[PDB]
Amino acid sequence: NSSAEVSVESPSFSFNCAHFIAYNGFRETLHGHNYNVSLKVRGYVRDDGYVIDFSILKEKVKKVCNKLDHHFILPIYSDVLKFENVKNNIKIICEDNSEYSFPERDCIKLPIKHSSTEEIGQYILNQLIEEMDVSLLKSRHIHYIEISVSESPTQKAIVHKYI
Amino acid sequence: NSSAEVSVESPSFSFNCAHFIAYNGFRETLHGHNYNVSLKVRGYVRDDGYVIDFSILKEKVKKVCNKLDHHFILPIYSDVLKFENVKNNIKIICEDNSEYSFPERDCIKLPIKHSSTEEIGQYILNQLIEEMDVSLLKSRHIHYIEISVSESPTQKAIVHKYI
Amino acid sequence: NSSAEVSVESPSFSFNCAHFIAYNGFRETLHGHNYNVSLKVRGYVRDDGYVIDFSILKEKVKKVCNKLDHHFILPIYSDVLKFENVKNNIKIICEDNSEYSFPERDCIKLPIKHSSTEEIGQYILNQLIEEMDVSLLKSRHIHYIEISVSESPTQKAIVHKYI
Amino acid sequence: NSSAEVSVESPSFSFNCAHFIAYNGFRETLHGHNYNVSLKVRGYVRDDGYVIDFSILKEKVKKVCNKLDHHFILPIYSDVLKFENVKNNIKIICEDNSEYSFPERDCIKLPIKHSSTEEIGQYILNQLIEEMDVSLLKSRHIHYIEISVSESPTQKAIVHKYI
Amino acid sequence: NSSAEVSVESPSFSFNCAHFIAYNGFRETLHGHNYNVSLKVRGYVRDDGYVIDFSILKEKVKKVCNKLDHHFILPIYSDVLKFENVKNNIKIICEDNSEYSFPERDCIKLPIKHSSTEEIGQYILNQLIEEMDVSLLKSRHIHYIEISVSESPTQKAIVHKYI
Amino acid sequence: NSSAEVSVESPSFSFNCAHFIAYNGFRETLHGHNYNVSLKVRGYVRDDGYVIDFSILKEKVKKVCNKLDHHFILPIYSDVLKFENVKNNIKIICEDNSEYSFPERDCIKLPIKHSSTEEIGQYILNQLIEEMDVSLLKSRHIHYIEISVSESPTQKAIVHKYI
Numbered sequence A, B, C, D, E, F: 001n002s003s004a005e006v007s008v009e010s011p012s013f014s015f016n017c018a019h020f021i022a023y024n025g026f027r028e029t030l031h032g033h034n035y036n037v038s039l040k041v042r043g044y045v046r047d048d049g050y051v052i053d054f055s056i057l058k059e060k061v062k063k064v065c066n067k068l069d070h071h072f073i074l075p076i077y078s079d080v081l082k083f084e085n086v087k088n089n090i091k092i093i094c095e096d097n098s099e100y101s102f103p104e105r106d107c108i109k110l111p112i113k114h115s116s117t118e119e120i121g122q123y124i125l126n127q128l129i130e131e132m133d134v135s136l137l138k139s140r141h142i143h144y145i146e147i148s149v150s151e152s153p154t155q156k157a158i159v160h161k162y163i
């Protein structure tokens, strides 16, 4: 068969963030991770000799990671957390009525229900798909994209999209 | 597409064992390995934000590895070895009439024909599927499980099961 | 020469924490890291065949890491942060008057001036020296201890003590 | 399911070469890489306990890598390069009229259009398939073979063949 | 003891170059490497909490690597090579009278006798010391600096300077 | 300062052996390890541009590893084990009167008291020192040699000799 894949991975494709998981009947304490992203795309060797240039993949991964890096990840779609702006701070109130308060600029609000590695990965995948531009990918006949997001060197989520 | 995978891997998911391969017309000398196990499951992001909790996968891999660790692996289904159990020892007699004798407690008797990485993997996969409980996996809509077993950092076997 | 070293390192010797650095005229946003610890000791091969048992070093590193894991690291000796404890929360007030508030149980209060990797390392080294018991180390003629603490796979601090 | 994979990878499966990419309207400066090869085959556990012996895979990978090691890779099917023999040297003329000249003995002439990691991969895969002998693979019921070629630790190409 | 070290390493701190070693009675064929650089400095925890900021070390390493990346390394102080300018090309004549010719823009002229990993390391160390500025290092009481240069994942040179 | 170090390391510099530790009042069960060796030497950059050629180090490490690979390691100097040859077998009797019996050709008899990683490392170091030849090392002004022996990726011993 003639489809081929290229992938990029680097300790440099990272965002260092704080978070905590909360879902129904469960809340854990604030902590954080070096999240690391790798990207794979399946296409064909085109007339320039590439599936797609490594440098485009690297540039797009770096960009998405840079936006996330150095914040508390706030899942705005959460069904078990309440958020309030008080002065320059976002206040987070949990089901058990415990409270956090951070400067608004420390938080990155992501359209996700939970700050789990799977849902963060889904977010990053959609972002990368937009950054690389769907029509570029189609012109090169790239039909599948996969990202891995590790929350540590021992645990990772892998999400994908057929395009 | 909406299926997602999670995987766990660590130097800690290891068992350090002695063994030798024996099949028709071939027997190698006793030696050993640090075997290492990584586990991946394919499912869907559930309402808790996970495919499945990383901590469940880690706890189950550690348990199966712990049972194997620090033994000679005895393939009880071998077609080319004869086994005797006299007093507190297991004697192994090979086709060329060479013999080994170990204290019975030093052996872990696996229901496999050869102590190859492939066959050890198949056994580990079945064990992990039992540990994780097949009905748990089904309630979360997990449909695929894969383990990699490395006999060293340079060589591994990958076995899977669709469920 | 006759001195010998043993070291242990693993992805498992980790603590996943939130923090931010603050020193005179500088404050960064809340974020987090997978911190990883490796331990090395210099001694002599003793009559049991060891510098010291690897299992002792692993057990002691795991214990110290476990205490830190899953918290916000609070540097109680900070010269640029004011701390208040009201009801069940710790409030942190910075020089620029920005504020953070966490549940008290979310914080691990370390006797350090900054939550830098260097200062966290020094604290870990002192703890491990206490855990391993200085008189045990002396009876085995261990004269040097070194820990590396990485804040990510790309950056680390190395602190030591001659004993 | 009953199919299984075995895989071999090592820093030892490398070839260190110089090259440059040239395609329509693009030429880069001469540089080099440590190319690294990993091999995976999919088959079944046979009556000897193996998908196929690891030692066969390693032996064949090392062989192909050793042929390539320590040369300038020249893509003889290039549509943007001209090659001419002058004394003991091969002269390369680019579209911009820039020129290179190397001794003949320093070039490995590969039947590829571009010295891209993708196309080098396709070359290596064919070679490996011939070295391992297609009918041996068939007798063991091996039906899929995949190689990864990395040009550095951060970027790689993955090519495959169903057989 | 109170001195501490910080270290930075990454697949990102690389330069991908072509070269060949030539010394008395020995010349090898043109090939290439992904050279990788790691930097360690020894100093003291200062009043900001750092030996020195990781970001300064990373910034300076990347800078030096970027200058070298994607060239043929030419050792201008070679006692067994002759270099001559012809049009836009540099001609290299070896002792055996074999010849190379590259465009000028494809060579990085380094003040080294041999393009060995040792001598490239010594060059990089001096450059890094100048980039980081000797008096900044002195004001922070940094007294030792060490770089590792790997020519591949399996072999490296380590050079240092006491300052 | 002008001394420099070169080191070689590879998953290929390995011996896969069985063993068990026995010392006074302690015996563990038969198991095994992939032992991995790395070698470092400190010297000076000589007139060929090297501290010493990487290829000599690699060749010597491979040789010593190859001799050990695929055996049970038998510490002939043990003060708590008794050995007897019975027909083609070596019988090992422990303090608790438990017994092992292996074909003589499965065992490599090492002049060490315990098959600990430290004592194996000491043995390997002396062997490597002999293989590289002390006078070669002296002519190049190499004054220090260090080997690391890991028994797994998480635990290692480091032994050295000033020469």
Ligand SMILES: C[C@@H](O)[C@@H](O)c1cnc2nc(N)[nH]c(=O)c2n1
Pocket: A020, A021, A028, A115, A116, A117, A118, A151, B006, B049, B050, B051, B052, B053, B054, B055, C016
């Ligand atoms: C333990 C901690 O990192 C926790 O936040 C955690 C635990 N288990 C998890 N499990 C999955 N699958 N994904 C996660 O993001 C996750 N996250």
Ligand SMILES: C[C@@H](O)[C@@H](O)c1cnc2nc(N)[nH]c(=O)c2n1
Pocket: A006, A049, A050, A051, A052, A053, A054, A055, D020, D021, D028, D115, D116, D117, D118, D151
């Ligand atoms: C960056 C350097 O390796 C350059 O020659 C380069 C750039 N982009 C690339 N991209 C792909 N896909 N394959 C290559 O081999 C490749 N090669």
Ligand SMILES: C[C@@H](O)[C@@H](O)c1cnc2nc(N)[nH]c(=O)c2n1
Pocket: E020, E021, E028, E115, E116, E117, E118, E151, F006, F049, F050, F051, F052, F053, F054, F055
């Ligand atoms: C094998 C290849 O990298 C060759 O050019 C080579 C061989 N031996 C070497 N040995 C040393 N010490 N340094 C080098 O840079 C070096 N370089």
Ligand SMILES: C[C@@H](O)[C@@H](O)c1cnc2nc(N)[nH]c(=O)c2n1
Pocket: B016, C006, C049, C050, C051, C052, C053, C054, C055, F020, F021, F028, F115, F116, F117, F118, F151
């Ligand atoms: C647990 C197992 O590998 C055991 O054989 C073991 C345990 N602890 C050890 N500890 C040291 N220091 N060295 C060893 O070789 C060693 N070896």
Ligand SMILES: [Zn+2]
Pocket: A019, A021, A031, A032, A033, A151
């Ligand atoms: Zn988490």
Ligand SMILES: [Zn+2]
Pocket: B019, B021, B031, B032, B033, B151
């Ligand atoms: Zn084996």
Ligand SMILES: [Zn+2]
Pocket: C019, C021, C031, C032, C033, C151
């Ligand atoms: Zn930080």
Ligand SMILES: [Zn+2]
Pocket: D019, D031, D032, D033, D151
């Ligand atoms: Zn390239």
Ligand SMILES: [Zn+2]
Pocket: E019, E031, E032, E033, E151
């Ligand atoms: Zn080289």
Ligand SMILES: [Zn+2]
Pocket: F019, F021, F031, F032, F033, F151
């Ligand atoms: Zn052991």
